[PDB]
Amino acid sequence: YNPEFKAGQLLRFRLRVNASVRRHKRVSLTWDASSTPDQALADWLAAKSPKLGFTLQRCELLQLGWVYGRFRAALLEGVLEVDDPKLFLKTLSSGIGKAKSFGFGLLSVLPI
Template sequence: MYLSMLKLNPRSRQVQAELRDPYQMHRTICKAFGVDKEAWKEARVLFRVDESNEGRMLRALVQSAIKPDWSRITAPDDYLLTEIQCKDVAPVFKAGQRLAFRLRANPTVKREGKREGIYGEMERLEWLNRKGEANGFFVQQARVISDGKQKGLTTRGCETVFSAAVFEGVLVVTDPDAFRAAFESGIGSAKGFGFGLLSVALVK
């Protein structure tokens, strides 16, 4: 697996446009893996934009199964503030391991065949607990540090609204194989819109 960090320029018009329509940022990022959509699928790209200092600092984290070639992306000179950093990551997961985590997700539930957003802190934490049970981890502690709605455009150009929540906390690995699969493929839906990337670090 590879993890890249892109420091985005919040004053860039393209960055601003992609924040309004995150799927366009997904398309920009995926160009680092070629122009073929099959190559995009093989790369299993996940990304998340983290903001700090009231949006004055933007960092896009990109996780992929294939090493990206960032020279392929087409973006104006003011798109990035610094050179892109990329490193090879090979985490080892063990049963009973405690990991600090951060996850930006799109909590949803299916009702009568339709996917609906989940709102409310308790309901979102319950959703996270269910995801843990299904993906080899137990949520020891968690909080929703940011929530709300995010608009975007589907591939057909239709406007859609996502339930956006950022979770932070500590989890315990219960099934290393299931957890690795979730770590590599992401948690929840709408991954092409910047959701699903699970970042973890050992709890000392």
């Protein structure tokens, strides 16, 4: 597999995220009663997307659940736009979160 992508190229991506935050232990992401889980997850992913190297355009939640062995798993799909071709390759094949040993960090990018 040799992924080559140019700057400013639209792609179709599927990614299962690990909503993990640290407080005063590691706890799952929690939203407010006036907001939907999809909005909170989209905002949380867009917060880290600058450092990752891609720009979110649209994203909807598909499967919000847990993975035992206890971890929190959320499956988000949509349309993303690559910012630069340098940081995107580093982000790929490395992970976008924690618990990478249980198959939580993985991207599948498709040309559109």
